[PDB]
Design a binder for this molecule. Structure first.
Ligand code: I68
Ligand code: I68
Lengths: 300, 300
C-alpha cells in the first residue's frame, strides 16, 4: 500500500535525449530513428520561415553525448524543428506521438545540455499550462506515458509564463492552449480543478485505508456539478462517471456517493486533517493512474 | 522556475532489475556485474541459516527479461541474498553501496516481476521507515541517488508495517531501524519532522518567488530548537546551519532568520495559504535537493 506521485521509469526516453546547439542557443532534442525533434526557437516577433530558410545544416550542432550528430536535412512542423541526422538512434523505443486532453497526466524528463536531470509527474491543466520545474536550457525536455512496451510522447517544453507555469507543444509542434513561441504578452488564463481526478484520488485514499471523508449521502450528477461550479471545479460528465466505474466497483462506493463526499469536503474543508498525506484536494492523478498504482501494472 | 518532487532518472537502475523466483515466492533482484542482490526472505521465526543450507543453486530461478540467468553460487550477507550468476550484467552502471542517514532522500524504482512499474522520491524518516508505494511482489525494488555518473544504491525493499509505511535494508542487507525480516509484531515508532529539510524547502520557495512567510525577526539556535521540540521537529544543529549556508548566501536570508519564519509558521499555521503548492510544511527535500533542482544539475 501507500500512494505516491509516481513517474514512469524514464529509461526509454533518456536513451533519446540529445543536445542541439545553434548560434548562441543550446537546448535539448529528442532523437527517434534518424530524426531529432526540438523547439524551433533554437534558430532565434520572429518569422521562423525566413529564419529557417537562412539556415544551413552545419549551423545545427547536435551532440548525442560525446558523439557529434551531423544534420543532413531539416524541416519545420508547426513549432518544432525536425533535424534529419545520418544515424538512426539504436536506443529508439517503440513509440507513438499523442496529443493529450486536459486532465491527463504524464511524466516529464527534465534535461539540460542533452542530459537528464530528473523525472517528475505533471498534469495538463484545464488552462493548458503545466506546473513544471524548468530552468534556462530545459527547452526540448519531453513529457510522456508508457503503455506496456510503447512510449507515448505527449509534450515538449518551450517556455515559462510570468506566473511560473509552463507551456509547450505536442511532438508535432502544436502548442497546448493559446500560446505562441514569440516573446509577447501571454498569460495562462483562469485555471480550474480537475474534478474526475480528485474523485479518483479519493478512491485511491479509500483503497489505501482512508475513509474519514465518506458519508451516507448521495447526490445527483446535476446537483453535484452545481456545487462544483462555485469551487472553481470542472463539470463532471456521465463519461467521467463511467470512467470511474472500475474504481467504484472495487471499493463498493457508488460514483455519485463519492461525489457527495467531495461536496462535503469543498463545503467544509478538511479541518486540519489530511488525505494521502495532503492537506489539499489533489487533482493530478487520473482514474487510470490510481488503478495502475493500486493494482501494480508494469511495463516491458 | 517551479519546484517538483523530482526523482532521479531511472534508466541506469532499470537496466539492473531482474526477477527472482524460489519455490512459490517471486520478487525482484538487483543484477550488478555477475551478482544478483535480493532480500533473503525469498527462501521462506525462521532461521535463514538452516533455510539457506537446505537450498541448491537450481532452486533459484533468475529471469532477466526473456533470458534465464543461471545461479552458480549463493551467499547471505545480513538480510540480503547474493546470487552469483554466470553472466555479468552488460548494463551495470558505475555504482556504490551507501548507507544513508535519516533525513536523506532518494529515488525509488518500484518493480514487479523484474519489471519497473514507476519511480518516485522518498526520504528516510527519522524513525527509519519510508513512506513508499509498494504492493505484493515489490520486494527487492531499490532506492538510489545518482552523482554525476555514479548510482549510489541506499535501499532495498523488504516489508510493510501495519501503519502502511515501509521498512528495508541497505544493499549490504542491514535494516534501517530496529526492524527484522520475520513475521513478528513490529511497529514504526514515533516519527518527527526533518527540520533542516523544511528550512531548505522554505529557501526553495524563496528562490521561486514565495516570500509571504518571511518576517523581520530572528532567533537564537537555542530558542528555535526550543519551539521545534514542542511541535515534534528534529533539533537543528550548528552543522545543519553550516549545511544551509549556500542557500542562505544565494537568497540573502540568514539561516537563523529563516528559523524565525519556521517558528511563526509552526505557531500560527498557514491560515489557508500554501507554499510551493502545499498546505503542509514539506520535509522530504534536502538542502542538496533544493540546490540541485534550483540550479539545474544533471548526470551522465
Ligand atoms: C528554453 O530552454 C526556455 C525554457 C524557459 C527558461 C526558464 N524556464 C523555462 O521554462 N524557454 C525560453 O527561453 C523561452 C523562449 C521563447 C519560447 C519565448 C522563444 N522564453 C521564455 O520562456 C521566457 N518567458 C517569456 O518571455 N514569456 C512570455 C513573455 C509570456 C513570452 C523566459 C522564461 C523569460 C526566458
Ligand atoms: C515483498 O514483495 C513484500 C512487500 C510487501 C507486500 C505488500 N507491501 C509490501 O511492502 N514483503 C513481504 O512479503 C513481507 C515478508 C517478510 C519481510 C515479513 C518476511 N511481509 C510483509 O511485508 C507483511 N507485513 C508484515 O507482516 N509486517 C510485520 C507484521 C511488521 C512483520 C505483509 C505486508 C502483511 C505481507
Amino acid at each position: 500500500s501507500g500512494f505516491r506521485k509516481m513517474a514512469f521509469p524514464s529509461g526509454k526516453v533518456e536513451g533519446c535525449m540529445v543536445q542541439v546547439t545553434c548560434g548562441t542557443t543550446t537546448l535539448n532534442g529528442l532523437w527517434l530513428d534518424d530524426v531529432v525533434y526540438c523547439p524551433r526557437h533554437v534558430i532565434c516577433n520572429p518569422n521562423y520561415e525566413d529564419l529557417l530558410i537562412r539556415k544551413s545544416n552545419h549551423n545545427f550542432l547536435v551532440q548525442a553525448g560525446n558523439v557529434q550528430l551531423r544534420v543532413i536535412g531539416h524541416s519545420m512542423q508547426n513549432c518544432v524543428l525536425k533535424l534529419k541526422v545520418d544515424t538512426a538512434n539504436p536506443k529508439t523505443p517503440k513509440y507513438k506521438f499523442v496529443r493529450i486532453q486536459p486532465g491527463q497526466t504524464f511524466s516529464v524528463l527534465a534535461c539540460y545540455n542533452g542530459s537528464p536531470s530528473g523525472v517528475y509527474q505533471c498534469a495538463m491543466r484545464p488552462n493548458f499550462t503545466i506546473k513544471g520545474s524548468f530552468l534556462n536550457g530545459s527547452c526540448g525536455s519531453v513529457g510522456f506515458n508508457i503503455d506496456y512496451d510503447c512510449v507515448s510522447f505527449c509534450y515538449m517544453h518551450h517556455m515559462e509564463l510570468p506566473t511560473g507555469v509552463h507551456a509547450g507543444t505536442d511532438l508535432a509542434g502544436n502548442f497546448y492552449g493559446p500560446f505562441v513561441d514569440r516573446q509577447t504578452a501571454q498569460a495562462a488564463g483562469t485555471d480550474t480543478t480537475i474534478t474526475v481526478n480528485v474523485l479518483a484520488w479519493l478512491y485511491a485514499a479509500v483503497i489505501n485505508g482512508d475513509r474519514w471523508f465518506l458519508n451516507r449521502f448521495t447526490t445527483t450528477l446535476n446537483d453535484f456539478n452545481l456545487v462544483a461550479m462555485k469551487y472553481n471545479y470542472e463539470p463532471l460528465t456521465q463519461d467521467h462517471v463511467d470512467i470511474l466505474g472500475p474504481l467504484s466497483a472495487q471499493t463498493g462506493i457508488a460514483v455519485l456517493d463519492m461525489c457527495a463526499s467531495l461536496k462535503e469536503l469543498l463545503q467544509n474543508g478538511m479541518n486540519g486533517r489530511t488525505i494521502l498525506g495532503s492537506a489539499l484536494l489533489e487533482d493530478e492523478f487520473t482514474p487510470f493512474d490510481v488503478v495502475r498504482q493500486c493494482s501494480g501494472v508494469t511495463f516491458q
